Amino acid sequence: DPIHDRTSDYHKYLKVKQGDSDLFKLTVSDKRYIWYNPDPKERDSYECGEIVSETSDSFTFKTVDGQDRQVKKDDANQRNPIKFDGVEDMSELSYLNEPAVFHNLRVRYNQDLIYTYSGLFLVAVNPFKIIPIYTQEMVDIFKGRRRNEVAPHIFAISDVAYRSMLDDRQNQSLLITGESGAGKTENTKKVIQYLASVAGRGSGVLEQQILQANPILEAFGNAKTTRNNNSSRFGKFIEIQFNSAGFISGASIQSYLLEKSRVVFQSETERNYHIFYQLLAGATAEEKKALHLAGPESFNYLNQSGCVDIKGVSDSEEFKITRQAMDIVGFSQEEQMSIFKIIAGILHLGNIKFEKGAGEGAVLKDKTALNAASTVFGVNPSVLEKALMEPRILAGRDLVAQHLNVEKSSSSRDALVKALYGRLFLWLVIKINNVLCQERKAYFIGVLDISGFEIFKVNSFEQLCINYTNEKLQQFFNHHMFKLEQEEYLKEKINWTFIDFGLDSQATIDLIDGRQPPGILALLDEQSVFPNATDNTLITKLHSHFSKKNAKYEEPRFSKTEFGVTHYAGQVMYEIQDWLEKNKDPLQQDLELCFKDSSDNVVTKLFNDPNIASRAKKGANFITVAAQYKEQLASLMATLETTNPHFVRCIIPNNKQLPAKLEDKVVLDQLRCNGVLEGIRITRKGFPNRI
Ligand SMILES: Oc1c(Cl)c(Cl)c(Cl)c2c1[nH]c1c(Cl)cc(Cl)cc12
Numbered sequence: 001d002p003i004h005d006r007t008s009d010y011h012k013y014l015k016v017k018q019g020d021s022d023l024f025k026l027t028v029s030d031k032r033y034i035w036y037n038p039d040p041k042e043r044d045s046y047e048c049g050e051i052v053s054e055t056s057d058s059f060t061f062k063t064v065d066g067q068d069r070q071v072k073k074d075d076a077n078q079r080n081p082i083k084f085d086g087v088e089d090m091s092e093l094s095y096l097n098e099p100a101v102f103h104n105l106r107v108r109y110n111q112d113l114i115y116t117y118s119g120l121f122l123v124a125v126n127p128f129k130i131i132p133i134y135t136q137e138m139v140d141i142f143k144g145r146r147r148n149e150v151a152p153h154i155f156a157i158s159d160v161a162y163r164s165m166l167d168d169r170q171n172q173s174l175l176i177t178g179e180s181g182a183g184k185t186e187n188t189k190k191v192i193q194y195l196a197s198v199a200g201r202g203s204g205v206l207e208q209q210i211l212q213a214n215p216i217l218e219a220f221g222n223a224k225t226t227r228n229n230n231s232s233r234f235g236k237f238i239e240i241q242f243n244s245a246g247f248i249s250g251a252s253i254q255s256y257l258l259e260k261s262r263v264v265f266q267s268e269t270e271r272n273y274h275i276f277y278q279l280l281a282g283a284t285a286e287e288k289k290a291l292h293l294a295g296p297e298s299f300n301y302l303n304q305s306g307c308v309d310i311k312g313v314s315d316s317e318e319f320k321i322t323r324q325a326m327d328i329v330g331f332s333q334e335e336q337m338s339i340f341k342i343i344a345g346i347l348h349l350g351n352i353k354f355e356k357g358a359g360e361g362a363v364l365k366d367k368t369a370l371n372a373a374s375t376v377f378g379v380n381p382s383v384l385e386k387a388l389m390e391p392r393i394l395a396g397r398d399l400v401a402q403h404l405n406v407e408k409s410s411s412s413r414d415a416l417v418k419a420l421y422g423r424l425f426l427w428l429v430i431k432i433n434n435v436l437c438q439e440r441k442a443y444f445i446g447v448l449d450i451s452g453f454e455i456f457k458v459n460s461f462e463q464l465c466i467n468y469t470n471e472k473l474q475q476f477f478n479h480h481m482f483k484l485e486q487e488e489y490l491k492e493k494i495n496w497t498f499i500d501f502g503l504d505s506q507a508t509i510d511l512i513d514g515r516q517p518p519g520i521l522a523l524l525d526e527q528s529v530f531p532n533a534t535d536n537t538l539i540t541k542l543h544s545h546f547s548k549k550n551a552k553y554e555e556p557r558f559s560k561t562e563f564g565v566t567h568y569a570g571q572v573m574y575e576i577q578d579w580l581e582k583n584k585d586p587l588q589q590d591l592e593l594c595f596k597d598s599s600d601n602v603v604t605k606l607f608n609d610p611n612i613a614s615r616a617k618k619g620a621n622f623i624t625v626a627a628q629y630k631e632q633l634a635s636l637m638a639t640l641e642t643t644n645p646h647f648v649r650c651i652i653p654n655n656k657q658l659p660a661k662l663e664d665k666v667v668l669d670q671l672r673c674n675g676v677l678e679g680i681r682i683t684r685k686g687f688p689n690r691i
């Protein structure tokens, strides 16, 4: 039994190292300790001091340097006895304060223990190194075991959730939270790996097909940002489906919010979608030739950033994992060849240079780029040319050929690009989903893997939607841990005095999504379908509704184009440039008409299927991105309320993507805004189990 043997892989990599006889003299000490601040400017930096004496209401302690401080017993962060260092579940701690909790994570982390229970939920501190705790060997260890008999792990939270689907005849969910780069996606993978092995078998084909559905998606929707080298630029809900017996019947992936703008623009040091790089690096010299390929350096979509690679990942190498993934999934070779044609053409569309012509409208002098794109897409180059610079609209009912300038022609090209890619994404997913939903499920476990909370020097509409989602997820923790918990108690009259935990990101949610009084998104919406509206008339309007009126909003004194929202995880400054176009998300109809006549079997499904090419009207208008997303979100929150939720809080150790560097400042922020200590306080003080 490997749980009980001190030499095993399980004991070596998931359990606290046996302390020696020196650490024993110290564990049995009668001395008592306190966590204090050496500089009261820096609240998150802690040193340890011995309590030397005590009055009625206060302790005196030794600082490290020399002196002796006095503070009130009520403002004292006491150090737990050292028998607690490395405890597996922090609800067991005698003292529940900030440095006390951080310290325990510090102890565990220093010997590579990334998982800690914080009562009912799991905490996962990111290692930024490979640690051998996800082998089949390790999966088997966790098969069936109750939570308090095995070490903390993601596999375990996964087992308990599974036991709970079978023992309550009720649907389950794993909500993995975290700012960008904190480890969400990695732990998501692990939930699926574990679920797959434990409840799998036709042969064992479905199982391999679900696992191999994530490298595809990752190639097309992950990219290098300044925060994460493998950042998910789309959100993911995965229902792993189970039969009446409790074996794997299927899986369905729902995606949210592809950052389509990445395809045509990256910030310094960042990358476009991995796929672009994988194609250019990993293709045969024959495949490069029929696609008119070159290196990344000769494409506008791939050479603006200064960076074409990521340290320790070979793009040549990832192209194989990806191709192998579309194989196992049952994408035909006609289908892949088209997929890389769509990807190849986007790059070419990117190389079209537009210049000023005789008058105010645009001409295209060199048609190398245009012709290449038309060639790989299966479309008439002269129809594309005209649809790009001279698209036709209605003026009243009259048909008017417009002649677009350099700025507007470029945007339209970009708009065509973003729609090609976005529709391509939607199609990969519906295809994957079709191979995998093969059975009417009796039960599911749902894994939520969102784009995590992010801030950049320049934060835009995408960031707002990313951060709004991260905010709703946080309130969803708040509702389950604190609001639902206590409204029971008080209803079962079993004698509870109400606690205000002081965690409520409601006023932030409402500022963004409220409809009456109107929130940011509704003011955006109203502005998008008002015809004299500009980015200037939009921010004035936002300032007008919220400056000095909502305690969650700021009009900055320093800029006339940014607004601040104070999120649970910090204040974010949003740039308004381009919001109206990002919300309307317009595409010229002549462009749509150019691509419906594609000789390509895939491109034609992106443009002719109502599934993928349609837009739901709203009276005299199309649905905005904000209203479409606010709704898909609400639709998911409704799916979650109907489940028993399990939470995993992923924690980023630092902001430099480094191993063995736990930055206290960075980790405590996250502990506060996540409500980690409030979650532990609710479990000590209260009564979870109720029959
Ligand atoms: O990526 C996109 C997605 Cl992912 C979706 Cl759902 C739609 Cl409706 C569109 C899109 N891109 C579009 C363009 Cl360029 C035009 C229209 Cl009318 C709809 C879309």
Ligand SMILES: [Mg+2]
Binding pocket: 184, 185, 231, 232, 449, 450, 451, 452
């Ligand atoms: Mg992710």
